[PDB]
């Protein structure tokens, strides 16, 4: 359970990005600026 709880909670982590929710970096920023933001949240959640 503790391994799951760590795995669940790190979805909330910003990983140095603007948001930790994709529907606010996409629906507010421009699609050139949305790319680098959605780039890092993939890499940050991958190494979780």
């Amino acid at each position: 359970a503790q391994a799951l709880n760590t795995l669940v909670k790190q979805l909330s982590s910003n990983f140095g990005a603007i948001s930790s929710v994709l529907n606010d970096i996409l629906s507010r920023l421009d699609p050139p600026e949305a790319e680098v933001q959605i780039d890092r949240l993939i890499t940050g959640r991958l190494q979780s």
Partner: protein
């Protein structure tokens, strides 16, 4: 109203008519300087 070039800025803080969905949206109206147009933005302390 966004379909106009009589205005100058349209700076919202496209995707910025996709984010316009919230509670009671205001229309705070005021006369600024051209040096104060730059300081109508979140922050600008």
């Amino acid at each position: 109203l966004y379909n106009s070039t009589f205005f100058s800025t349209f700076k919202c803080y496209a995707t910025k008519l996709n984010d316009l969905c919230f509670s009671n949206v205001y229309a705070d109206s005021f006369v600024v300087k051209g040096d104060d147009v730059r300081q109508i933005a979140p922050g600008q302390t």
